[PDB]
């Protein structure tokens, strides 16, 4: 039928997104991606949803049944998957998460060898085999079975990668972190701590049931209070899978995705790194966003909502920066999808490089 929506397959876990389905997914999809070498290499990550253990097990079961070599990542942000699947020449990757949705909902996402969403042609063949009521696919036996070697260490190869994308270390900057009790919990805290930043944490205590509960990129009022409480220079708010980012300035005010798109792409033009000095965005982007873009000599391309069209824009013409008012910011110089922490480090680069506090940089664009 229609299994692959925008953010892959979704449904509340067990009752809708069943483990039986999640097995059909990796057994049929692994076959779709097995067509090259008889031993593909799919690596699998997940957030902290307590249903994430159910589907991960059921997923890997399918992958092992068509001979695919499976590397378990464990808990890692969706941007980490995309970075690893591409930086390991692995044939695909899977992220069991349902970004910012309640703990009860979960979802399977698919990336290709390059780190983008699977070709619509492959997703088609996946639902094709899900419609035939006869599991007539090959069933390897003995040595021909799949193979699983855990790679829980990918957490820090993705961490090492973000470390270098810090133009320098953020010494003398106090930041308050809300990671939505999600994948970014243990990752983000080490990152800014080893970057010698004064880190102050909240929502960094996940337990498979509290994810995206009054915290994260959708519920910013907790951080906002917190940032003023500890008088931290800023607040960063990732979401459950770490692809969005919502900032909170020292006054406590919110800094949505348009404003962060402005702050970073403005600072990028000052380093000659903004390709052709243009930024892709969405219809959802506020009017004053585009008003202060021209004030800085930055052109703009508008696309429809959904980051499959913002990425398609940055694809055909080689643009550097795109994103949404949601906070989902893509920096195609470093990663292939929306990255919360990469978005966060670019913001920290602007904060350290100009000395200015975040309220001031965000006041250049006037919201309508």
């Amino acid at each position: 039928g229609k299994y692959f929506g925008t953010d892959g397959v979704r449904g509340v876990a067990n009752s809708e997104l069943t483990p039986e389905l999640a097995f059909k997914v990796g057994r049929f999809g692994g076959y779709v991606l097995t067509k090259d070498k008889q031993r593909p290499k799919v690596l699998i990550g997940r957030d902290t949803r307590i249903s994430g253990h159910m589907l991960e097990g059921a997923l890997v079961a399918g992958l092992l049944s068509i001979g695919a070599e499976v590397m378990r990542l464990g808990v890692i942000s969706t941007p980490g998957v995309s970075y690893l699947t591409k930086a390991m020449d692995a044939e695909a990757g899977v992220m069991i998460s349902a970004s910012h949705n309640p703990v009860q909902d979960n979802g399977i996402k698919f990336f290709g060898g390059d780190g983008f969403k699977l070709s619509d042609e492959q997703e088609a063949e996946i639902e094709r085999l899900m419609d035939e009521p006869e599991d007539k696919l090959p069933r390897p036996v003995g040595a021909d079975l799949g193979l699983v070697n855990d790679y829980f260490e990918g957490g820090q190869k993705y961490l090492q990668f973000l470390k270098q994308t810090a133009d320098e270390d953020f010494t003398g900057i106090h930041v308050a972190l809300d990671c939505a009790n999600g994948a970014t919990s243990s990752l983000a805290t080490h990152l800014f701590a080893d970057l010698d930043a004064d880190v102050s944490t909240m929502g960094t205590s996940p337990n498979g049931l509290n994810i995206n509960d009054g915290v994260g990129s959708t519920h910013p009022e907790a951080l906002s209070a917190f940032v003023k409480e500890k008088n931290a220079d800023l607040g960063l708010a990732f979401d459950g899978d770490g692809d969005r980012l919502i900032a909170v300035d020292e006054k406590g005010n919110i800094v949505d995705g348009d404003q962060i798109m402005y702050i970073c792409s403005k600072h990028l033009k000052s380093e000659g790194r903004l390709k052709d000095d243009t930024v892709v965005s969405t219809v959802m982007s506020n009017l004053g966003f585009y008003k202060a873009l021209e004030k800085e000599g930055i052109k703009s391309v508008q696309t429809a909502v959904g980051d499959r069209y913002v990425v398609e824009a940055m694809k055909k013409d080689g643009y550097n920066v795109g994103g949404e008012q949601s906070g989902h910011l893509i920096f195609l110089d470093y990663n292939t999808t929306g990255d919360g922490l990469l978005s966060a480090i670019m913001l920290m680069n602007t904060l350290k490089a100009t000395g200015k506090p975040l309220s001031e940089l965000a006041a250049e664009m006037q919201k309508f």
Partner: protein, 146 residues
Amino acid sequence: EAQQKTIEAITKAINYMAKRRIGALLTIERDTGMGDYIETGIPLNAKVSSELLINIFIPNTPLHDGAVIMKNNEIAAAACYLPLSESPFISKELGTRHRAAVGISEVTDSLTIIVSEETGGVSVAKNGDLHRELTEEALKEMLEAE
């Protein structure tokens, strides 16, 4: 002086593991400051003792999964993570923890001791050169130089 202890602590701890075939991995900083590899494990800053190093690697625990780091005569951190080397001189027999032991002596002036969880063979890695199947005196002499 204070060197006989902490060396007597390592030997009796490694010989503990070699008889039982427990995979170990201990790196000894000297001149290369290994800060960017101590901030990757579970920090401890503990005092060196035979029995503590034993508990660190027990077939499967939180702290087992990685590499013990030794700055000063202190156990700097456990579950540390090292870069692999992808050198063709690593016998394809073994790997994972021997692949990182040589992989961390390539960057640093450090000294790594390895216990192979397949055989029990004590190895050692300094400046990219690893030496498999070492003896007890041959681990005691190698450590008295440091």
